[PDB]
PDB file of C-alpha atoms and ligand atoms in Angstrom:
ATOM      1  CA  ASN A   1     178.523 137.324 182.077  1.00  0.00           C
ATOM      2  CA  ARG A   2     176.830 139.025 179.142  1.00  0.00           C
ATOM      3  CA  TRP A   3     175.953 142.093 181.274  1.00  0.00           C
ATOM      4  CA  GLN A   4     179.481 142.627 182.450  1.00  0.00           C
ATOM      5  CA  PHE A   5     180.623 142.797 178.984  1.00  0.00           C
ATOM      6  CA  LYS A   6     178.259 145.691 178.427  1.00  0.00           C
ATOM      7  CA  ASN A   7     180.048 147.575 181.332  1.00  0.00           C
ATOM      8  CA  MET A   8     183.438 146.775 179.888  1.00  0.00           C
ATOM      9  CA  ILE A   9     182.235 148.394 176.455  1.00  0.00           C
ATOM     10  CA  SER A  10     180.759 151.155 178.600  1.00  0.00           C
ATOM     11  CA  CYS A  11     184.251 151.493 180.317  1.00  0.00           C
ATOM     12  CA  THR A  12     186.367 151.951 177.159  1.00  0.00           C
ATOM     13  CA  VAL A  13     183.789 153.517 174.824  1.00  0.00           C
ATOM     14  CA  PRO A  14     181.667 155.696 177.052  1.00  0.00           C
ATOM     15  CA  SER A  15     180.298 157.633 174.241  1.00  0.00           C
ATOM     16  CA  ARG A  16     178.597 154.628 172.813  1.00  0.00           C
ATOM     17  CA  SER A  17     175.719 152.389 174.178  1.00  0.00           C
ATOM     18  CA  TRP A  18     176.400 148.615 173.866  1.00  0.00           C
ATOM     19  CA  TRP A  19     173.600 148.468 171.222  1.00  0.00           C
ATOM     20  CA  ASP A  20     175.956 149.982 168.648  1.00  0.00           C
ATOM     21  CA  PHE A  21     177.875 146.870 168.711  1.00  0.00           C
ATOM     22  CA  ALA A  22     174.767 144.480 169.048  1.00  0.00           C
ATOM     23  CA  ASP A  23     174.268 144.303 165.382  1.00  0.00           C
ATOM     24  CA  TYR A  24     177.134 145.638 163.305  1.00  0.00           C
ATOM     25  CA  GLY A  25     179.056 143.949 160.528  1.00  0.00           C
ATOM     26  CA  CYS A  26     179.011 140.202 159.990  1.00  0.00           C
ATOM     27  CA  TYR A  27     180.292 139.582 163.448  1.00  0.00           C
ATOM     28  CA  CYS A  28     179.396 141.917 166.282  1.00  0.00           C
ATOM     29  CA  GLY A  29     176.245 140.540 167.799  1.00  0.00           C
ATOM     30  CA  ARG A  30     175.032 136.929 167.709  1.00  0.00           C
ATOM     31  CA  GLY A  31     176.386 134.279 165.240  1.00  0.00           C
ATOM     32  CA  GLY A  32     178.813 135.260 162.447  1.00  0.00           C
ATOM     33  CA  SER A  33     179.907 134.329 159.095  1.00  0.00           C
ATOM     34  CA  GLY A  34     181.501 135.575 155.946  1.00  0.00           C
ATOM     35  CA  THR A  35     184.147 138.255 155.771  1.00  0.00           C
ATOM     36  CA  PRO A  36     184.522 141.133 158.396  1.00  0.00           C
ATOM     37  CA  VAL A  37     183.422 144.230 156.796  1.00  0.00           C
ATOM     38  CA  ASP A  38     186.034 146.424 158.711  1.00  0.00           C
ATOM     39  CA  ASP A  39     188.339 146.591 161.610  1.00  0.00           C
ATOM     40  CA  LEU A  40     185.560 146.658 164.197  1.00  0.00           C
ATOM     41  CA  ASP A  41     183.910 143.592 162.894  1.00  0.00           C
ATOM     42  CA  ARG A  42     187.311 141.818 162.924  1.00  0.00           C
ATOM     43  CA  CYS A  43     187.407 142.574 166.656  1.00  0.00           C
ATOM     44  CA  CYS A  44     184.086 140.632 167.043  1.00  0.00           C
ATOM     45  CA  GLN A  45     185.055 137.621 164.906  1.00  0.00           C
ATOM     46  CA  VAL A  46     188.179 137.342 167.121  1.00  0.00           C
ATOM     47  CA  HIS A  47     185.896 137.631 170.098  1.00  0.00           C
ATOM     48  CA  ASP A  48     183.631 134.966 168.848  1.00  0.00           C
ATOM     49  CA  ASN A  49     186.742 132.639 168.294  1.00  0.00           C
ATOM     50  CA  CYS A  50     187.809 133.415 171.865  1.00  0.00           C
ATOM     51  CA  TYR A  51     184.330 132.324 173.195  1.00  0.00           C
ATOM     52  CA  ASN A  52     184.522 129.216 171.219  1.00  0.00           C
ATOM     53  CA  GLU A  53     187.704 128.218 172.954  1.00  0.00           C
ATOM     54  CA  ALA A  54     186.525 129.332 176.474  1.00  0.00           C
ATOM     55  CA  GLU A  55     183.644 126.680 175.731  1.00  0.00           C
ATOM     56  CA  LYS A  56     185.971 123.681 175.534  1.00  0.00           C
ATOM     57  CA  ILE A  57     186.425 124.143 179.255  1.00  0.00           C
ATOM     58  CA  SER A  58     183.985 121.838 180.860  1.00  0.00           C
ATOM     59  CA  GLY A  59     180.542 123.487 181.764  1.00  0.00           C
ATOM     60  CA  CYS A  60     181.762 126.987 180.854  1.00  0.00           C
ATOM     61  CA  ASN A  61     178.880 129.165 179.556  1.00  0.00           C
ATOM     62  CA  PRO A  62     180.769 132.480 178.693  1.00  0.00           C
ATOM     63  CA  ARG A  63     177.341 134.279 178.274  1.00  0.00           C
ATOM     64  CA  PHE A  64     176.450 133.293 181.896  1.00  0.00           C
ATOM     65  CA  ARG A  65     179.841 132.888 183.682  1.00  0.00           C
ATOM     66  CA  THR A  66     180.035 135.810 185.928  1.00  0.00           C
ATOM     67  CA  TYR A  67     183.708 136.848 186.494  1.00  0.00           C
ATOM     68  CA  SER A  68     185.666 139.220 188.635  1.00  0.00           C
ATOM     69  CA  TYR A  69     186.707 142.486 186.999  1.00  0.00           C
ATOM     70  CA  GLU A  70     187.449 146.131 187.555  1.00  0.00           C
ATOM     71  CA  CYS A  71     187.196 149.186 185.505  1.00  0.00           C
ATOM     72  CA  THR A  72     189.300 152.078 186.738  1.00  0.00           C
ATOM     73  CA  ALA A  73     189.164 155.386 185.070  1.00  0.00           C
ATOM     74  CA  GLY A  74     189.406 153.545 181.693  1.00  0.00           C
ATOM     75  CA  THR A  75     191.567 150.763 182.496  1.00  0.00           C
ATOM     76  CA  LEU A  76     189.960 147.143 182.563  1.00  0.00           C
ATOM     77  CA  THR A  77     191.410 144.445 184.738  1.00  0.00           C
ATOM     78  CA  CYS A  78     190.455 140.799 185.335  1.00  0.00           C
ATOM     79  CA  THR A  79     191.338 140.085 188.886  1.00  0.00           C
ATOM     80  CA  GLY A  80     192.846 136.641 189.906  1.00  0.00           C
ATOM     81  CA  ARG A  81     189.608 135.547 191.877  1.00  0.00           C
ATOM     82  CA  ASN A  82     188.339 133.791 188.661  1.00  0.00           C
ATOM     83  CA  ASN A  83     188.447 130.189 187.847  1.00  0.00           C
ATOM     84  CA  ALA A  84     189.794 128.784 184.525  1.00  0.00           C
ATOM     85  CA  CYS A  85     186.387 129.447 182.839  1.00  0.00           C
ATOM     86  CA  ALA A  86     185.719 132.857 184.343  1.00  0.00           C
ATOM     87  CA  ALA A  87     189.423 133.858 183.899  1.00  0.00           C
ATOM     88  CA  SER A  88     189.261 132.823 180.283  1.00  0.00           C
ATOM     89  CA  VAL A  89     185.997 134.570 179.606  1.00  0.00           C
ATOM     90  CA  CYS A  90     186.948 137.713 181.477  1.00  0.00           C
ATOM     91  CA  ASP A  91     189.961 137.945 179.098  1.00  0.00           C
ATOM     92  CA  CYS A  92     187.827 137.297 175.958  1.00  0.00           C
ATOM     93  CA  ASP A  93     185.710 140.322 176.902  1.00  0.00           C
ATOM     94  CA  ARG A  94     188.544 142.572 178.084  1.00  0.00           C
ATOM     95  CA  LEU A  95     190.650 142.385 174.838  1.00  0.00           C
ATOM     96  CA  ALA A  96     187.333 142.667 172.851  1.00  0.00           C
ATOM     97  CA  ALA A  97     186.415 145.929 174.758  1.00  0.00           C
ATOM     98  CA  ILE A  98     189.869 147.376 173.953  1.00  0.00           C
ATOM     99  CA  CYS A  99     189.635 146.385 170.428  1.00  0.00           C
ATOM    100  CA  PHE A 100     186.367 148.231 170.010  1.00  0.00           C
ATOM    101  CA  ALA A 101     187.932 151.353 171.488  1.00  0.00           C
ATOM    102  CA  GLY A 102     190.763 151.130 168.933  1.00  0.00           C
ATOM    103  CA  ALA A 103     188.726 150.661 165.863  1.00  0.00           C
ATOM    104  CA  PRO A 104     186.470 153.309 164.107  1.00  0.00           C
ATOM    105  CA  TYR A 105     182.832 153.077 163.906  1.00  0.00           C
ATOM    106  CA  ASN A 106     181.394 152.859 160.425  1.00  0.00           C
ATOM    107  CA  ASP A 107     177.740 153.841 160.849  1.00  0.00           C
ATOM    108  CA  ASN A 108     177.097 152.364 157.406  1.00  0.00           C
ATOM    109  CA  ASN A 109     178.041 149.069 158.755  1.00  0.00           C
ATOM    110  CA  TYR A 110     175.624 149.023 161.565  1.00  0.00           C
ATOM    111  CA  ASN A 111     172.634 146.515 160.860  1.00  0.00           C
ATOM    112  CA  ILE A 112     173.736 145.794 157.406  1.00  0.00           C
ATOM    113  CA  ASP A 113     172.050 143.117 155.030  1.00  0.00           C
ATOM    114  CA  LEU A 114     173.488 139.938 156.480  1.00  0.00           C
ATOM    115  CA  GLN A 115     172.353 137.800 153.447  1.00  0.00           C
ATOM    116  CA  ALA A 116     173.611 140.193 150.763  1.00  0.00           C
ATOM    117  CA  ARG A 117     177.020 140.867 152.545  1.00  0.00           C
ATOM    118  CA  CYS A 118     178.009 137.797 154.719  1.00  0.00           C
ATOM    119  CA  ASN A 119     177.613 134.436 152.913  1.00  0.00           C
TER     120      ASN A 119
ATOM    121  CA  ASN B   1     173.754 121.487 164.731  1.00  0.00           C
ATOM    122  CA  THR B   2     172.481 124.546 163.032  1.00  0.00           C
ATOM    123  CA  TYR B   3     173.059 122.823 159.466  1.00  0.00           C
ATOM    124  CA  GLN B   4     170.356 120.390 160.868  1.00  0.00           C
ATOM    125  CA  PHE B   5     168.123 123.105 162.291  1.00  0.00           C
ATOM    126  CA  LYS B   6     168.446 124.780 158.800  1.00  0.00           C
ATOM    127  CA  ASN B   7     167.144 121.813 157.145  1.00  0.00           C
ATOM    128  CA  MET B   8     164.142 121.318 159.645  1.00  0.00           C
ATOM    129  CA  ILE B   9     163.099 124.687 158.656  1.00  0.00           C
ATOM    130  CA  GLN B  10     163.657 124.151 154.842  1.00  0.00           C
ATOM    131  CA  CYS B  11     161.298 121.284 155.346  1.00  0.00           C
ATOM    132  CA  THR B  12     158.399 122.890 157.273  1.00  0.00           C
ATOM    133  CA  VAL B  13     158.685 126.318 155.453  1.00  0.00           C
ATOM    134  CA  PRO B  14     159.892 125.494 152.116  1.00  0.00           C
ATOM    135  CA  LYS B  15     158.828 128.746 150.606  1.00  0.00           C
ATOM    136  CA  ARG B  16     161.380 130.852 152.657  1.00  0.00           C
ATOM    137  CA  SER B  17     165.006 131.157 152.560  1.00  0.00           C
ATOM    138  CA  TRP B  18     166.460 130.335 156.046  1.00  0.00           C
ATOM    139  CA  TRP B  19     168.083 133.914 156.036  1.00  0.00           C
ATOM    140  CA  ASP B  20     164.481 135.110 156.385  1.00  0.00           C
ATOM    141  CA  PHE B  21     164.672 133.981 159.895  1.00  0.00           C
ATOM    142  CA  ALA B  22     168.226 134.843 160.664  1.00  0.00           C
ATOM    143  CA  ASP B  23     167.565 138.458 161.315  1.00  0.00           C
ATOM    144  CA  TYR B  24     164.019 138.823 162.224  1.00  0.00           C
ATOM    145  CA  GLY B  25     162.545 140.570 165.224  1.00  0.00           C
ATOM    146  CA  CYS B  26     164.167 140.909 168.432  1.00  0.00           C
ATOM    147  CA  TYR B  27     164.963 137.313 168.969  1.00  0.00           C
ATOM    148  CA  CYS B  28     165.432 135.255 165.838  1.00  0.00           C
ATOM    149  CA  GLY B  29     169.177 136.111 165.629  1.00  0.00           C
ATOM    150  CA  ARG B  30     170.656 139.380 166.818  1.00  0.00           C
ATOM    151  CA  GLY B  31     169.570 141.181 169.885  1.00  0.00           C
ATOM    152  CA  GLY B  32     168.198 138.360 172.276  1.00  0.00           C
ATOM    153  CA  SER B  33     166.274 140.646 174.473  1.00  0.00           C
ATOM    154  CA  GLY B  34     163.175 142.833 174.785  1.00  0.00           C
ATOM    155  CA  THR B  35     159.527 142.166 173.774  1.00  0.00           C
ATOM    156  CA  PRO B  36     158.814 139.837 170.936  1.00  0.00           C
ATOM    157  CA  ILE B  37     157.447 141.835 168.042  1.00  0.00           C
ATOM    158  CA  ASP B  38     155.059 139.352 166.851  1.00  0.00           C
ATOM    159  CA  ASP B  39     153.910 135.629 166.659  1.00  0.00           C
ATOM    160  CA  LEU B  40     156.927 134.397 165.006  1.00  0.00           C
ATOM    161  CA  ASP B  41     159.597 136.469 167.133  1.00  0.00           C
ATOM    162  CA  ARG B  42     158.046 134.682 169.923  1.00  0.00           C
ATOM    163  CA  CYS B  43     158.877 131.383 168.440  1.00  0.00           C
ATOM    164  CA  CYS B  44     162.542 132.310 168.412  1.00  0.00           C
ATOM    165  CA  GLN B  45     162.385 133.587 171.962  1.00  0.00           C
ATOM    166  CA  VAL B  46     161.046 130.113 173.142  1.00  0.00           C
ATOM    167  CA  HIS B  47     163.826 128.602 171.020  1.00  0.00           C
ATOM    168  CA  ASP B  48     166.373 130.652 172.913  1.00  0.00           C
ATOM    169  CA  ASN B  49     165.175 129.651 176.270  1.00  0.00           C
ATOM    170  CA  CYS B  50     165.111 125.952 175.046  1.00  0.00           C
ATOM    171  CA  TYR B  51     168.755 126.214 174.289  1.00  0.00           C
ATOM    172  CA  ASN B  52     169.643 127.584 177.735  1.00  0.00           C
ATOM    173  CA  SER B  53     167.871 124.768 179.389  1.00  0.00           C
ATOM    174  CA  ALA B  54     169.647 122.133 177.009  1.00  0.00           C
ATOM    175  CA  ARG B  55     172.916 124.105 177.647  1.00  0.00           C
ATOM    176  CA  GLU B  56     172.632 122.777 181.378  1.00  0.00           C
ATOM    177  CA  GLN B  57     173.943 119.172 180.603  1.00  0.00           C
ATOM    178  CA  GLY B  58     177.665 119.143 180.689  1.00  0.00           C
ATOM    179  CA  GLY B  59     179.264 119.222 177.199  1.00  0.00           C
ATOM    180  CA  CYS B  60     175.721 119.842 175.548  1.00  0.00           C
ATOM    181  CA  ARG B  61     176.494 122.679 173.019  1.00  0.00           C
ATOM    182  CA  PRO B  62     173.174 123.180 170.932  1.00  0.00           C
ATOM    183  CA  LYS B  63     174.675 124.886 168.068  1.00  0.00           C
ATOM    184  CA  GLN B  64     177.405 122.330 167.543  1.00  0.00           C
ATOM    185  CA  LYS B  65     175.547 118.958 168.668  1.00  0.00           C
ATOM    186  CA  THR B  66     174.430 116.561 165.845  1.00  0.00           C
ATOM    187  CA  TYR B  67     171.222 114.599 166.410  1.00  0.00           C
ATOM    188  CA  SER B  68     168.903 112.178 164.489  1.00  0.00           C
ATOM    189  CA  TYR B  69     165.962 113.714 162.698  1.00  0.00           C
ATOM    190  CA  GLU B  70     163.938 112.689 159.856  1.00  0.00           C
ATOM    191  CA  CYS B  71     161.885 115.257 157.735  1.00  0.00           C
ATOM    192  CA  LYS B  72     159.202 113.526 155.803  1.00  0.00           C
ATOM    193  CA  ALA B  73     156.145 115.087 154.351  1.00  0.00           C
ATOM    194  CA  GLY B  74     156.452 118.134 156.445  1.00  0.00           C
ATOM    195  CA  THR B  75     156.370 115.967 159.556  1.00  0.00           C
ATOM    196  CA  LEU B  76     159.592 116.407 161.654  1.00  0.00           C
ATOM    197  CA  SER B  77     160.708 113.726 163.978  1.00  0.00           C
ATOM    198  CA  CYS B  78     163.590 113.366 166.371  1.00  0.00           C
ATOM    199  CA  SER B  79     164.397 109.566 166.516  1.00  0.00           C
ATOM    200  CA  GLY B  80     164.745 107.542 169.799  1.00  0.00           C
ATOM    201  CA  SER B  81     168.629 107.288 169.075  1.00  0.00           C
ATOM    202  CA  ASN B  82     169.595 110.680 170.237  1.00  0.00           C
ATOM    203  CA  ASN B  83     171.085 110.876 173.897  1.00  0.00           C
ATOM    204  CA  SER B  84     169.984 113.192 176.497  1.00  0.00           C
ATOM    205  CA  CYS B  85     171.538 116.270 175.007  1.00  0.00           C
ATOM    206  CA  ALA B  86     170.875 115.350 171.340  1.00  0.00           C
ATOM    207  CA  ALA B  87     167.376 114.348 172.436  1.00  0.00           C
ATOM    208  CA  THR B  88     166.750 117.793 173.897  1.00  0.00           C
ATOM    209  CA  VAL B  89     168.492 120.026 171.445  1.00  0.00           C
ATOM    210  CA  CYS B  90     166.507 118.209 168.765  1.00  0.00           C
ATOM    211  CA  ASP B  91     163.083 118.638 170.353  1.00  0.00           C
ATOM    212  CA  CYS B  92     163.940 122.369 170.631  1.00  0.00           C
ATOM    213  CA  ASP B  93     164.590 122.793 166.955  1.00  0.00           C
ATOM    214  CA  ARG B  94     161.457 120.652 165.893  1.00  0.00           C
ATOM    215  CA  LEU B  95     159.104 122.792 167.922  1.00  0.00           C
ATOM    216  CA  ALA B  96     160.721 125.970 166.495  1.00  0.00           C
ATOM    217  CA  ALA B  97     160.487 124.537 162.995  1.00  0.00           C
ATOM    218  CA  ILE B  98     156.869 123.821 163.315  1.00  0.00           C
ATOM    219  CA  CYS B  99     156.189 127.177 165.034  1.00  0.00           C
ATOM    220  CA  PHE B 100     157.755 129.003 162.121  1.00  0.00           C
ATOM    221  CA  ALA B 101     155.556 127.300 159.660  1.00  0.00           C
ATOM    222  CA  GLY B 102     152.505 128.516 161.584  1.00  0.00           C
ATOM    223  CA  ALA B 103     153.407 132.087 162.567  1.00  0.00           C
ATOM    224  CA  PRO B 104     152.687 134.762 160.073  1.00  0.00           C
ATOM    225  CA  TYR B 105     155.800 136.486 158.668  1.00  0.00           C
ATOM    226  CA  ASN B 106     156.065 140.266 158.586  1.00  0.00           C
ATOM    227  CA  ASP B 107     158.681 141.665 156.326  1.00  0.00           C
ATOM    228  CA  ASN B 108     158.355 144.894 158.225  1.00  0.00           C
ATOM    229  CA  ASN B 109     159.907 143.092 161.275  1.00  0.00           C
ATOM    230  CA  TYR B 110     162.912 142.017 159.209  1.00  0.00           C
ATOM    231  CA  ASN B 111     166.266 143.522 160.098  1.00  0.00           C
ATOM    232  CA  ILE B 112     164.760 146.102 162.454  1.00  0.00           C
ATOM    233  CA  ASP B 113     166.542 148.695 164.435  1.00  0.00           C
ATOM    234  CA  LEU B 114     167.333 146.514 167.414  1.00  0.00           C
ATOM    235  CA  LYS B 115     168.521 149.660 169.537  1.00  0.00           C
ATOM    236  CA  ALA B 116     165.130 151.367 169.178  1.00  0.00           C
ATOM    237  CA  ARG B 117     162.797 148.579 169.313  1.00  0.00           C
ATOM    238  CA  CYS B 118     164.068 145.989 171.671  1.00  0.00           C
ATOM    239  CA  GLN B 119     164.784 147.864 174.808  1.00  0.00           C
TER     240      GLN B 119
HETATM  241 CA1   CA C 201     179.110 136.773 167.186  1.00  0.00          CA
HETATM  242 CA1   CA C 202     169.438 143.386 161.875  1.00  0.00          CA
END
């Protein structure tokens, strides 16, 4: 669920609150449109697509589906106790939290003007 | 779908671009959490709750479900054709569309610092 995805970000980017990703670029944070401003934003577009697939599973609400994971000294792991939905969702979040850790944070891309830069 | 919800707004609040509401306060877009900054932000929060309830019917996906509405004179109307989901998602947009037309708009509350104002 949404809350768990915050802990994954906490697990791979311990120096950053999850609020720095809440509204960054044209994708990180709700909705999403236009061309990704950078690498970090591209991680979030991918994450959205991922969620969009995970929703094809019957009755699968990514944002609420509580899954089974483990964060060990930096290493994220989706255990096998998850159902097709939870299993998918967990993977969408894991690959996203690692993608953020890999990308560089452009402070000038935090809370940009959506209208001007994302149509 | 959101193309439709975007039309209900364009219909009840013709003096404003839909973008004016895509990034306003803590609930009208990004963030989705905290205390509504004003009468308008509260409209979106209620819209958000409304979508979660509607998300309960299997397959019902608010952002992607098309319904039957008619906008004439500033008076919206969901026709008695929509099915369970369609009928619910529609009523959600309709009530939000109206709300938006009756709630004051504060520029100061547009594109605010989510991290420092929605905790
Ligand atoms: Ca998004
Ligand atoms: Ca913003």
